[PDB]
Design a protein around this nucleic acid. Sequence first.
DNA 1: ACCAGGGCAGGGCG
DNA 2: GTCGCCCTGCCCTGGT
Lengths: 62, 61, 62
Amino acid sequence: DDPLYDEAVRFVTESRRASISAVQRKLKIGYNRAARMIEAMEMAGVVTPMNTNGSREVIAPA
Amino acid sequence: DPLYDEAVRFVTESRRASISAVQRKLKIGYNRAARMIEAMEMAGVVTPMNTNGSREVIAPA
Amino acid sequence: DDPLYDEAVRFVTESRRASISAVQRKLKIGYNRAARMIEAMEMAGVVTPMNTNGSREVIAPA
DNA sequence: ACCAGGGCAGGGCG
DNA sequence: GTCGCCCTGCCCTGGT
């Protein structure tokens, strides 16, 4: 539902970075907003769940 | 970034170009500090990273 | 004026270890928080600046 | 009442 | 074992 969602998924899948932090940097948005889009990406199988140390890997092809 | 000149002044005086040093100095987060180091690199104030990961400051103090 | 500064100073001066990492572990604080306090100790003459070889020494007595 | 980003601790690396 | 720095996620300030 976020206007930036499509752009966030593009960034994530092109850059191969699945971090909330990286999205915040690229789109100049806050933690809550970026976290929600990442959670949507997880919910939609674009991005992995995080492992114990918080890192995720990009599922979707670029 | 409105703090760009301050960051430039900091690195050119200290000769330190770590993201973290700038982040602490300017009381800012990692993302904003990284962005500023990137701007300094694009403006020739500091070098890009070498093999290990360290930058040199090119601008005079 | 970090609340934990005096505590950090007592640990550094007792241990003779002027290290950001040792303070992190001793106090259970983040890297930047510990680094800020080491920097503060440098400016106050409690520890030396970082040497060109990396190292730091404690100046102040225990 | 909103919301970017700075407060926090620390894992993963050279 | 040790070190410092990059970059992370999570929590809550700061602000016109």
